[PDB]
């Protein structure tokens, strides 16, 4: 669901990418894939700033790695934990930065 | 298959709702732009968009079509839409207006929004006829 | 380069995804990764695809659908065989991406 | 003095790399700043075009008032910051600014919330910062 934060259930990738955010429109939720963006802990790191928004939340301080955006099977969204709706503008702007350079 | 069309009905209504807001905005372009330019932030612009009634203008006849009532999502409060004789937007409609790219204001892209909203009204009636 | 078309050299995926297109901004050419969208031949499609989400592409290489919903970040190392460029489809590709995300 | 380029071998080549990226980025932002200085007439032009392709054509085929960015645009340093691939028919001619296709394309891709006060300012701040970075980079290489 759009802007919902999900726990990464893969033990292999959980250390550098604890969480990911769903950025796909809810109007397309019959697709069996989801476009998501990984979050990486700031401690495991400066980031390009306009590309990689800094996320201050209850789970901690993260950098959203927009450039590692990728589509995944919907099945890996089994564990929702939070939501990032108040970051909507920052997220959409970062995505625009990656694609339009605007 | 029945679950499929119930699903398509739900999404067609949500989609028609967003498009309806865009059609209203694009019929009030001057006043929409002035309001956005005057707002310090996108949040304040959003609040200005939803906190006033909008004149239906050139799209009055389109929004009053018979099949407009059926195209309304079930989560929509009665407060939203036309309250005589102006249109009150939702946060979701406001957000979509703020995210419009400028090239959407060209004649062809404006027409596509209106054509698509109309096509949806017909699609919504068809899905219901299927149930 | 942005909108450059690349031959997929991965034999295990090349049948369904014989080409992909870089959609990443050139201002970000310094990254070691690229955002790409795979194309799939229309002939392999077993059903109609949403045209707002999946632009049709008719080029010298063939007749394709752009699978926007399967866009992904890939190592820059796999962009080894560029064959064409799709910059004339810029508006269609950017709108397809907008449709995936912003909804409209 | 501002540490714009990471230490670590081939500093001069890497400084030139940052300079050429900065000029390209400043070129786009300059278009947006100019468009944002003329936003009513820019928006009227687009509304009056049938297609994005015709709007892009309209945007580049006439001169724009410099408006609130005139002082920045007319600075000798700002001319020195232009990409060197840019032909003489672009930028300022007879008091008016002539856009490239690339800058017109970015204008068309602006979202409406960029017109809000704070977003418009962030485009101007980013443009000015880039100009400052470019002047600094160039000076480093001027010896």
Secondary structure (H, E, C), B41-84:
CHHHHHHHHHCCCEECHHHHHHHCCHHHCCCCCCCCCCCCEEEC
Task: Name the strand (E) or helix (H) holding C75.
Answer: strand C72-75
CB contact under 8 A, D106 and A96: no
Give every CB contact of residue C102 below 8 A, 6+ residues apart in sequence. Answer: A25, A92, B96, B99
Q: Which two tokens stand for residue C103?
A: 């909804």
Instruction: State whether residue D125 is helix, strand or coil.
Output: helix
Resolution in A: 2.2
| Closest in A28, A33, A99 to C24, CB measured | A99
CB B22 within 8 A of CB B113: yes
Phi-psi region for residue A83, left (φ > 0), alpha (ψ -120 to 50) or beta? beta
Q: Is A85 exposed, middle or buried (0-12, 13-18, 19+ CB in 10 A)?
A: exposed
Which DSSP state fits A54?
E
Instruction: State whether residue D62 is helix, strand or coil.
Output: coil
Distance CA D49, CA D46 (A): 5
Range of the domain at C29: 1-104
- Tokens 């250390």 — which residue? A15
Cα A44 to its chain centre, rounded Å, is 16
* Number of domains composing chain C: 1
CB B87 within 8 A of CB B24: yes
Q: Which two tokens stand for residue B53?
A: 């009634």
CATH label of the domain that carries residue C49: 2.30.30.110
C-alpha distance from C79 to closest chain A C-alpha (Å): 16
Distance spanning both ends of chain A, measured CA to CA:
26
Q: Is D112 exposed, middle or buried (0-12, 13-18, 19+ CB in 10 A)?
A: buried
CB contact under 8 A, A89 and B42: yes
* Structure determined via: X-ray
Give every CB contact of residue B95 below 8 A, 6+ residues apart in sequence. Answer: A88, B46
Q: Which two tokens stand for residue B104?
A: 């959407």
Q: Which of A88, A94, A100 shows the shortest CA–CA distance to A25? A: A88
CB D19 within 8 A of CB A93: no
Helical axes B2-26 vs B91-99, angle rounded to 10°: 70
CB D103 within 8 A of CB D41: no
Task: Name the strand (E) or helix (H) holding C33.
Answer: strand C33-41
Distance CA D25, CA D130 (A): 8
Q: Is D8 exposed, middle or buried (0-12, 13-18, 19+ CB in 10 A)?
A: exposed
Helical axes B42-50 vs B91-99, angle rounded to 10°: 130
Handedness of CA D44, D45, D46, D49 (dihedral sign): positive
Give every CB contact of residue D65 below 8 A, 6+ residues apart in sequence. Answer: D37, D38, D41, D96, D97
B1-131 CATH fold: Topoisomerase; domain 3 (1.10.268)
Distance CA B122, CA B115 (A): 11
Give every CB contact of residue D95 below 8 A, 6+ residues apart in sequence. Answer: D63, D66
CB contact under 8 A, B11 and A27: yes
Question: What does residue A55 show for φ and ψ, rounded to 5 degrees?
Answer: -110, 110
C-alpha distance from A65 to closest chain D C-alpha (Å): 21
Distance CA D116, CA D100 (A): 25
| Closest in B7, B14, B15 to A30, CB measured | B7
Distance CA B121, CA C9 (A): 46
Distance CA B12, CA B131 (A): 15
Own/partner pairs, D37-40, CB within 8 angstroms, 24+ separation: D37/D65, D37/D66, D37/D67, D37/D68, D37/D69, D38/D64, D38/D65, D38/D67, D39/B33, D39/B37, D39/D115, D40/B33
**Half-sphere exposure (CA, 13 Å, Cβ side) for A70?**
15
Give every CB contact of residue A73 below 8 A, 6+ residues apart in sequence. Answer: A32, A33, A34
Distance CA A90, CA A51 (A): 9
Residue D112 sits at the chain A interface (C-beta within 8 Å):
no
Distance CA C99, CA A27 (A): 9
Cis peptide before B2 (omega within 30 of 0): no
Q: Which CATH class is domain D1-143?
A: mainly alpha
Cα C18 to its chain centre, rounded Å, is 10
CB C68 within 8 A of CB C96: yes
Question: 10 Å Cβ neighbour count for D143?
Answer: 4
Distance CA C102, CA C99 (A): 6
Cα B127 to its chain centre, rounded Å, is 20
Q: Which two tokens stand for residue B130?
A: 């299927």
Strand partners, A80: A6
CB contact under 8 A, C102 and B18: no
CB A59 within 8 A of CB A20: no
Domain ranges in chain B? 1-131
| Closest in D25, D106, D113 to A100, CB measured | D106
């Amino acid at each position: 669901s759009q802007f919902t934060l999900y726990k990464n259930k893969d033990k292999s990738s959980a250390k550098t990418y604890p969480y990911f955010v769903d950025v796909q429109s809810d109007l397309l939720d019959n697709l069996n894939t989801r476009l998501v963006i990984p979050l990486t802990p700031i401690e495991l790191l400066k980031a390009p700033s306009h590309l990689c928004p800094t996320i201050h939340i209850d789970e901690g301080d993260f950098i959203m790695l927009t450039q590692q955006m990728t589509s995944v099977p919907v099945k890996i969204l089994s564990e929702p934990v939070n939501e990032l709706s108040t970051f909507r503008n920052e997220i959409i702007a970062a995505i625009d930065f990656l694609i339009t350079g605007i | 298959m029945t679950r499929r069309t119930i699903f398509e009905l739900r999404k067609a209504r949500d989609r028609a709702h967003i498009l309806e807001g865009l059609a209203l905005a694009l019929a009030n372009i001057d006043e929409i732009i002035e309001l956005i330019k005057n707002a310090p932030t996108p949040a304040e612009a959003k609040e200005g968009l939803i906190s006033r009634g909008w004149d239906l203008g050139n799209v009055a006849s389109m929004l009053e079509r018979a099949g407009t009532d059926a195209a309304r999502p079930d989560w929509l409060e009665p407060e939203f839409g036309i309250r005589e004789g102006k249109y009150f937007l939702t946060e979701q409609q406001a957000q979509a207006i703020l995210e419009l790219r400028l090239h959407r204001l060209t004649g062809l892209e404006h027409e596509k929004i209106l054509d698509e909203y109309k096509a949806l009204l017909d699609e919504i009636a068809e899905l219901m006829h299927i149930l």
